[PDB]
Amino acid sequence: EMSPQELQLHYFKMHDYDGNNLLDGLELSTAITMSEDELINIIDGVLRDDDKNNDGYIDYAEFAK
Amino acid sequence: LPHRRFEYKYSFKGPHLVQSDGTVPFWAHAGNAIPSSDQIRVAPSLKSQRGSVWTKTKAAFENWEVEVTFRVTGRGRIGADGLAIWYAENQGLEGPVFGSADLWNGVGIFFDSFDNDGKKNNPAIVIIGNNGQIHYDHQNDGASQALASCQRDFRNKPYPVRAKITYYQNTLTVMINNGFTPDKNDYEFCAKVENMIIPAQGHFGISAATGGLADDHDVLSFLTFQLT
């Protein structure tokens, strides 16, 4: 079984399809579960809270906060 | 300089390109475009096809850059008709201009496979601006309408072709990875438009068409970046 920190890294890695060790909004859209507008609201929220340099990507530290 | 911000809302890519219902999130598709999990077949290798994919909302970026990765694949040494990349005020979902609407307000970057004027200068990449009143000159491959162009055989290449199109400080630059190698960052200069004027807000788009001759026109990804 995986610990809290392990499942979190697993979730991060499993949705990093291009392997750049960052999550972008498209990758995040697959990592939920809804309409596109609700999806946008959620993703914009994650980026607002996690994406420190506003480049559209978040690394594991930012994702895990 | 400048910095890029990836803009997910104006982008698509695999390996989960389509939603559970086969729609592309944040994009509308029309005509005979076929979305799938790892690419969109914007127009398939059948006779007389038109297809397109356009962003659902307008982008409002002062400066921007798109990286579009695609294949144009056909059995013949000659194919038709080609693929178009768009930034325009309105969605041009259906029409006679590489599957999209004529009389656009903005810029079309046309990957024109078929030499309609017999000038032995295809495949070509042709950049055509429009204010909403110009009809694309299909019979002459837009020759007299082209702001800038290059000759580049983007058909039947072993690795995906890539177009990096940069709108920065009223200039449009087109760089092309010709797909001879798997080096995705191997770009070569194609063309540059000076004093490029485009609408302040607009949809991004991609479209393709075929005629009597027909290639598969596949887009693997359309990645949009805001430049700051």
Ligand SMILES: [Ca+2]
């Ligand atoms: Ca990633």
Ligand SMILES: [Ca+2]
């Ligand atoms: Ca970031």
Ligand SMILES: [Ca+2]
């Ligand atoms: Ca042509």
Ligand SMILES: [Ca+2]
């Ligand atoms: Ca020609």
